[PDB]
Amino acid sequence: MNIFEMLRIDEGLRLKIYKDTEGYYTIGIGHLLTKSPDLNAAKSELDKAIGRNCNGVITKDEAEKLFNQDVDAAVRGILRNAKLKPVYDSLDAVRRCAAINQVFQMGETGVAGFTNSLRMLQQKRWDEAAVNLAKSRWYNQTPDRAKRVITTFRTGTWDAY
């Protein structure tokens, strides 16, 4: 297991524009295109992201290219966030994957607001952090995925995947 295999499980792979769990136009491996309800706006974002007129459809290679960019941007965003970087750097490699997964799904601003969970993670109070993390809209809206990510934070193992 690694961050790519982990997010591939959590996000799936779809080559045509679809709506994510929040109803937002998405493609590939969890590549959010737009929060606009206008499919044309989503198609415009897709074409801009890929560099050609896609008409709502991409190849697996293109999906994997956006995924590589999105993972890289997620972890670099963590390192550039003054609240997230010290917590991330305190973690072992497996728990760092859980952190990237959260930011990939929720955005770095949503994650950085998890002030009490982040402190428990930095303190290595793993069971307490896991309890706090589940007290969230994140968990209630995507409980099976959140349970996997939380188990990863709690144990530092890949048991949930």
Curated annotation (Swiss-Prot):
EC number: 3.2.1.17
Effect of E11 to A/F/H/M/N: Complete loss of enzymatic activity
Chain residues that bind substrate: L32, F104, S117, N132
Reactions the enzyme catalyzes: Hydrolysis of (1->4)-beta-linkages between N-acetylmuramic acid and N-acetyl-D-glucosamine residues in a peptidoglycan and between N-acetyl-D-glucosamine residues in chitodextrins
Annotated phenotype, changing T26H: Facilitates transglycosylation more effectively than hydrolysis; covalently bound substrate
Keyword list, A-Z: Antimicrobial, Bacteriolytic enzyme, Cytolysis, Glycosidase, Host cell lysis by virus, Host cytoplasm, Hydrolase, Viral release from host cell
Upregulating conditions: Expressed late in the viral replication.
Gene behind this protein: E
One Gene Ontology biological process: defense response to bacterium
Function: Endolysin with lysozyme activity that degrades host peptidoglycans and participates with the holin and spanin proteins in the sequential events which lead to the programmed host cell lysis releasing the mature viral particles. Once the holin has permeabilized the host cell membrane, the endolysin can reach the periplasm and break down the peptidoglycan layer.
Active site residues of this protein: E11, D20
Name of the protein this chain belongs to: Endolysin
